């Protein structure tokens, strides 16, 4: 799985081991803790 899983910036700069990608932009806006995903933790 690639491409951002939120704003679909167009490509996945970081494909988490959970299949939840997140472009840098977004990754630079979210705190991100526990090397987890916001779509899962919630
Ligand atoms: Zn994004
Ligand atoms: Zn996840």
Swiss-Prot record:
Tissue expression, as annotated, is: Isoform 1 is testis-specific. Isoform 2 is expressed in heart, brain, skeletal muscle, kidney and pancreas. Isoform 1 is not expressed in fetus or in azoospermic patients.
Question: Where is the signal peptide, in residue numbers?
Answer: none
- Where does this polypeptide localize? Membrane
Zinc finger regions typed RING-type: which residues? 4-41
Q: What is the stated purpose of this protein?
A: May be involved in spermatogenesis.
**Protein name in UniProt:** RING finger protein 141
Coding gene? RNF141
Positions spanned in the full protein: 152 to 193 of 230
């Amino acid at each position: 799985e690639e491409e951002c899983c939120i704003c679909m910036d167009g490509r996945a700069d970081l494909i988490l081991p959970c299949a939840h990608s997140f472009c840098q932009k977004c990754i630079d806006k979210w705190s991100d803790r526990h090397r987890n995903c916001p779509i899962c933790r919630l």
